[PDB]
Amino acid sequence: PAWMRTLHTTASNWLHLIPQTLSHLKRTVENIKDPLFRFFEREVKMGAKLLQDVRQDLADVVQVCEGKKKQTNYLRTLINELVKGILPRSWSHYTVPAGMTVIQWVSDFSERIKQLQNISLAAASGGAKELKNIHVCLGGLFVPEAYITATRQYVAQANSWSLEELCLEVNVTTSQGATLDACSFGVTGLKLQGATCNNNKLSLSNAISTALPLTQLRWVKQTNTEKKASVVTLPVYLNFTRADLIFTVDFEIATKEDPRSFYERGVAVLCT
Amino acid sequence: FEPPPGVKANMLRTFSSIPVSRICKSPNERARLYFLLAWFHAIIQERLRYAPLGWSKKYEFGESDLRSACDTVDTWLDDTAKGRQNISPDKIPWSALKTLMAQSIYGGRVDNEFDQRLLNTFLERLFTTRSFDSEFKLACKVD
Amino acid sequence: ERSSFPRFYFVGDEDLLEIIGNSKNVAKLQKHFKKMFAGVSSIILNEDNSVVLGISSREGEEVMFKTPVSITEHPKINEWLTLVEKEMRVTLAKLLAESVTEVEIFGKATSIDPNTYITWIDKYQAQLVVLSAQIAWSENVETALSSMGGGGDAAPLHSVLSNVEVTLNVLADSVLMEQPPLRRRKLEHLITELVHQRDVTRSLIKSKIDNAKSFEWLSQMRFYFDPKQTDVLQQLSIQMANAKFNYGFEYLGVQDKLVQTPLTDRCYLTMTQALEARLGGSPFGPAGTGKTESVKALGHQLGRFVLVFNCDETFDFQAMGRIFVGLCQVGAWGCFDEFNRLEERMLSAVSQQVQCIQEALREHSITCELLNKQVKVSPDMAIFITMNPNLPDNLKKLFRSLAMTKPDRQLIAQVMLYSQGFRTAEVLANKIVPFFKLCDEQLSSQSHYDFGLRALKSVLVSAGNVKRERIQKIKREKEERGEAVDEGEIAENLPEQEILIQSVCETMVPKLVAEDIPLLFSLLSDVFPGVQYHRGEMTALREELKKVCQEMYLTYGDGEEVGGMWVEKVLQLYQITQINHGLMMVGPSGSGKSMAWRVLLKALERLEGVEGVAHIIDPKAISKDHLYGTLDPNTREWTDGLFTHVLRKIIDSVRGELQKRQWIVFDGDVDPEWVENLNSVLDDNKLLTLPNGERLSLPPNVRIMFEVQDLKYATLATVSRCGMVWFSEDVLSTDMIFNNFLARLRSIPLDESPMLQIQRDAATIMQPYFTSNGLVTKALEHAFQLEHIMDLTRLRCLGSLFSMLHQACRNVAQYNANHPDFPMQIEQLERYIQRYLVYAILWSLSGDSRLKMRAELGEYIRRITTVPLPTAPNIPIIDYEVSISGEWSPWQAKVPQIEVETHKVAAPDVVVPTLDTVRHEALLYTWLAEHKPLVLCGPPGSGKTMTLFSALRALPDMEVVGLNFSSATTPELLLKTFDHYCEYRRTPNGVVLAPVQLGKWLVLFCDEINLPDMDKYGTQRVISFIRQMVEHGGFYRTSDQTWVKLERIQFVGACNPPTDPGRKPLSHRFLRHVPVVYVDYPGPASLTQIYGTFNRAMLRLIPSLRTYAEPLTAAMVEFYTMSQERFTQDTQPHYIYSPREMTRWVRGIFEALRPLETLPVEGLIRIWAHEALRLFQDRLVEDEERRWTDENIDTVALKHFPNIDREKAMSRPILYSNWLSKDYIPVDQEELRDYVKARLKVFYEEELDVPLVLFNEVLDHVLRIDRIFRQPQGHLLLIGVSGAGKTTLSRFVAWMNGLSVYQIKVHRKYTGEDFDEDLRTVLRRSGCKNEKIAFIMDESNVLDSGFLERMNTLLANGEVPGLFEGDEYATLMTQCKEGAQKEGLMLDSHEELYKWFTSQVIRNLHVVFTMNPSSEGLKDRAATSPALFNRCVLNWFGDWSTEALYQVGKEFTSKMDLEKPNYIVPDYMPVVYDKLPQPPSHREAIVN
Ligand SMILES: Nc1ncnc2c1ncn2[C@@H]1O[C@H](COP(=O)(O)OP(=O)(O)OP(=O)(O)O)[C@@H](O)[C@H]1O
């Protein structure tokens, strides 16, 4: 059947596209003490497991396509989902937009695995200290709220502060013109929909989306001072479907702006 | 059969659905309130079509919620204005309407905190004594 | 009757009948009051039991009626019930008035006196004092707003807030010091409400509200009390927003107060608006957000009882219908929990019901149709539906919605901390809540992990208890050292972060896996920085544990010492017992959970002086209806379940068990079917609710624990509702098990002392090998690396090794007994024990694997050990045995050389001894001496059933009972076997099940122990039951729910590999107790020996051929070899080969030879070829397979019989028949065709006239089928495309041989009972009549798998006991009696005539099964019912071949004349018929 031949073609194409393997992080007592290393090791293990599962499933599909392997119930269900264009349930272990088809999912998985491979290489080259200074895309991670919590824990442990007394400040600056302080963590890929951010100041704009060059998350002691009238709280959704709420950022609107207009127009930060 | 899109069409359907006698009661201001309610309802429903942007999910802001809001307005206006032909716009129980239509009606389906914030913004913009002036703007810089 | 006073309408028909019958027995009415009241569990009466003095709640708080209701004055049940309810409402209102006046005296006060406040709290109820505080605060705020109405004036409202503050202060001092638990709950509720009132008053102050009608005040829930109101019921009115509700005034007793967090307030507003608008509310949202609780709190605050149903997948309707109509008549609220879980049809039905009720409610804004009855719906009725993400389409317009997206955990804590009396509660809450978020996120995911709200709540309650205990300890120290006592001083100087850390650790560390323990500490270092805790050792408990471990022969240790981890786990179990009533010891089997809790119970008994009693209940083995209790659908009688029975026994306090410590251990797997009922017990309410409605209060001394190995299937609800203790397999190290075995061997004698001295000497000998990193440990580590047929469990291997060493000690004792002159000296004893130990590791660790891994283990142990070993160059130590002289002697010498009798060839009973036979006989002897159940696992056939049977019949005192387990096996089968062969007797220990035959060990052989199907939760009921009697030494009789101890009963099982289709792997917990021996197919040498013996015994009939016995057997084996190598099971599901085929071969050759007095070698080769074709060729599917088979048998015949003629011995027409000749001598195909054609003509004349063309395949088929009918118990599995003639030939053969054809007329309504009755008729028609029946079955006639199960049992036993019972069985008995009288056999008892009936059926009845060639369907049929593939012989009709089609065409188109002389032969003839004549005629061309 021609469907079998074209499924062979697309399976081979994806097996070429997806990276080969992922390297687990090396455990160490000092690394175990570090929370960022723990979070990144969990992410690496999850990514490696999912990558191995997907690669083995694609290899089994290819072997069936040659006729060398018979379609078991799991393999038959996978083939049916592939032909119908629906995302297999086994593959989807992280949160994914509902309408995303298989090809886009494979592309996203490839990008995430590339990011994880770079992260593992950087960690192996240095350690947790280098792991602190890695600019990581929140959308690329499987659980970005875990990353936010990990940064909070790292800042609390470095300065011997308590977790509940720390608050988050966002500094949106260019990647080249950025300062990596002790409490500052870089994040890329955030996109602002409904507004433009210049000099950490929000301005209303008609553009559909303005890409934030580099967002610096800084954990600071609770000043216990009321937020100014120009301070606006913007949600950070994981994808464009706006079903996942990672956290909330606080920005300073420009003068002559109205925060109610910001609320009405649905201005929000998106991970991807 | 589908409802014709358009704030004008939505308001016309809302006004046709409500009996004419109810909107014309002892307080002459009551009709004004109803109009505002209709407008607000229309706006809310017309933000459903832009689901990712206007809201976070396709809520069921159906006719039942509109009927509940009309009943709430009726009861609170009757309690505040006990058979008075005219009532001052300040004396209108604005806070009761805003709170009830932010938490009980139109807010029971709202689970996202930011959707609740948007609903509160809309209610505080529309339902106020300042609406009873001829300078009130139902919308700003439309075109 | 129920129409008047609808309040008792709540109960069903059962309780109505009971209250009508026992109306005068008021003491028996307490269950009804427990059912319908919320808090009232009993009514307080006098000694005369004639006047209702008051009411009493489950906690012990009671209310005395101002004017008691006299039952004598109103004999009618309804009249005095209504009087009691009215009295309770009026008295509650009067007490509310009194307490409101008292608290108003307390209100408006600069300071309050603690003694007066505590006295006021003690005087009234918790609900009443909370309501009085609410009323007083509401009135004070209303007065303040009335004063403020002027506007721009001074604010005494501050004072009101200050008032609350000051009284809050005294509360913060009341809970610090020790209080009675009831007053403690009262103080907790009062503190929670006072904190809420202070917060809302602060909000009012901030808002500067100065008008009483301002909506900011109107939103808050307000209470108004009007003494002036004539009706006490209407005195209290709860107004919030525009909604108004009259207070229920119904006694709630004491309930858990819910801190009113922002969300809960929003919920209150939304639900009150919905109820005012006369439609219910749906608080949809995720799990554990307050959805259900919030509804219950709203109902209780209005004085109403909410009935919270559970909408699980297994949901009852008639109970739901009765409970719902009861609520409708009562007017009490009803909440639905997780509506979406309901089945779509179930959902639609319940949605329609609630739609009708809601429509009635809106119409009331009055009776409605419910269960074909008129139900009066009170206006106060309300309905709530909690959902998890929508509402059904018919309900979307009838119900408001509300979002419980996220609970206010940060406040819930703060408020509960201030309730416990903690200072700096804000910081502690802001630390603890994110800490639990971290635990829920950062810790590795596990099935038993739980970090939800319920956890926070519990952890905080435990922290409050810990702080109170520490306060008491410091107070006692101050009493002993000095005299300055000041509770405030102790509280101020008391660290509180340390208390929270200690409580968190005591509650959560036990459930943490080995890897997650450090992370938690790091998490604490992140949340509670710089503050550390140190666990307080229990020195007295450690000493008691050491003594009990010494008494029980267990290893005890401290810290890093051996057994330290186990001791820490026992201490953690003790702490969880202290801080919880529901426990769960999770961990892989073999972690010591059972012994951990047993040792802890014994140590607690010996320490505290409170004797402990443990009830071990297996939930899965018993039925859930028998577990919790049965309510008869018609007689409505309630019989308490096992758990219900033991709980009622404990509550009754008959023999002081309330004094004792009762531990109910639910040993067994847990699934969300039975434990759902236990969810009402594991919560803080601690009550068991039965379907009859009767609720039993859980005594404080009772602890519920689930000794469950895995939690992959338990719901998160139960996980969150009980404490968890994790027992990793690393807890019980191997050294501990070795020490336990050695101590038990040294201490207890094996018989029940000389052999005790022998055991001590043996333990001294093997002590070097049992040390840490010894021979046994390294051998076990290597054995885990190999592959085994079943799952490897460390305790299984260790238990088998210990049993075999016990057998070694018994052998030493026997040798000493038989040699009184010379008992075995020390050197020979060391040699024997060392060699037997090596042999014991060899046969214990690798006793369940193939020979290659057995040899691998042998080589490894040879490399690593120092014990002397046999010097055989290639023979492994396994074929060697250890003699009583301590020497390595070959097993071959133990193998004799017997010559079977000629008439006994291939007989079922005879077993030819060989290497595998003797080795497995020795292993079976050993594992039967200790009565240890064992499992013989191996491929089909393989000599497993017979090898076991030979051993068991060799044993004299052990009778055998076989039980063919099927895919539908249930413990009722074991119960039937027990009541058939054993009997219950009352003994001083208790009731005991023992065989009716004295001094006999009944062995319940189970033919297929892994066949039974597992439930949807991975549990096999029969396997769990067998494990239960094996490990607990007994089971539970459900007729009276009593512990039955098994006496002289042991189990033995056999099974095919679990990897085979239709085979389920056994539980690890069960596999721990049963050693598995892998009986592989006998090797070529074993087959050669066994069947050379059979051939030599066979050929004694014809001496002139005797000398050919040796090669023939080889040939018979030789060909067979490549058969098992060529047609593997991968190609086809039925392509299996076993020594059973070879035995059938020998039997067939003997049957062919016995008639004939003399016969040359060519005739013998012809018989052998005929049998090879009839065994190894009909099963084949493809033509090339048959060609290969024929060529291979040809080659084998020439290889082993070279000096023979191929044309005569191996003539192509191999047709054997007894139709023409008297004897079974081969017949030419043509003469056979002529005879069967004449028989077909007679068939046409007599039976149905259908023309049948006689192609050569029909001859072969009519021969094989006739062969099968002639042999007793001849059963066929005909396979072929439909219409090929399977039934056509079956009917023909049955008519020819005299068998009456019987087919079952199957239709759509042909139920299982109809098939059962047809089977009964056939059984009557076969055995009772001595009339042979050809039973025609087609898979179309099969409408259910149960048909196949009954057929399986019939094939495997020649009968099915299930069909014939009671009057039917008596009719059968009469019939077989008449039949035996006619035939000439005089038998009286039922058993002998039943056996004669079974023999008659097995010799007469013949069942055939026709099927189409569905290979996947073939595999499913084989897996579902093994008997159709076990002994049923199956043929491959397939489809008519080209030759067959050609012959059909010619014979049928013989009448028409396609004889055309003008036909010319073409140059190219498209030949498709193989034997087409070289000139095609016109007719030949047309047929082609
Ligand atoms: N402290 C100990 N020292 C030495 N041996 C011990 C100790 N505790 C238990 N054992 C032994 O180890 C084995 C543990 O059996 P036990 O039934 O307690 O395990 P389990 O994990 O509860 O298994 P199951 O869940 O199947 O009941 C037994 O042979 C027991 O005698």
Ligand SMILES: Nc1ncnc2c1ncn2[C@@H]1O[C@H](COP(=O)(O)OP(=O)(O)O)[C@@H](O)[C@H]1O
């Ligand atoms: N406002 C609250 N005050 C006190 N406890 C609460 C509150 N909200 C929720 N809880 C607790 O949280 C848990 C949620 O249980 P439940 O109400 O059954 O949740 P759900 O119905 O969402 O499954 C319970 O232990 C409940 O007592």
Ligand SMILES: Nc1ncnc2c1ncn2[C@@H]1O[C@H](COP(=O)(O)OP(=O)(O)O)[C@@H](O)[C@H]1O
């Ligand atoms: N040592 C032996 N002596 C005699 N017959 C044997 C021996 N080993 C195997 N057989 C033959 O193999 C067959 C084994 O079948 P059986 O053990 O009943 O299968 P299962 O154990 O699966 O029920 C028997 O028919 C028997 O004739």
Ligand SMILES: Nc1ncnc2c1ncn2[C@@H]1O[C@H](COP(=O)(O)OP(=O)(O)O)[C@@H](O)[C@H]1O
């Ligand atoms: N040897 C044969 N010659 C001619 N017709 C046959 C032969 N065997 C079967 N049939 C035909 O098959 C029909 C019955 O098929 P049946 O045996 O019921 O199919 P199944 O194989 O499903 O049992 C009869 O009508 C008969 O004509």
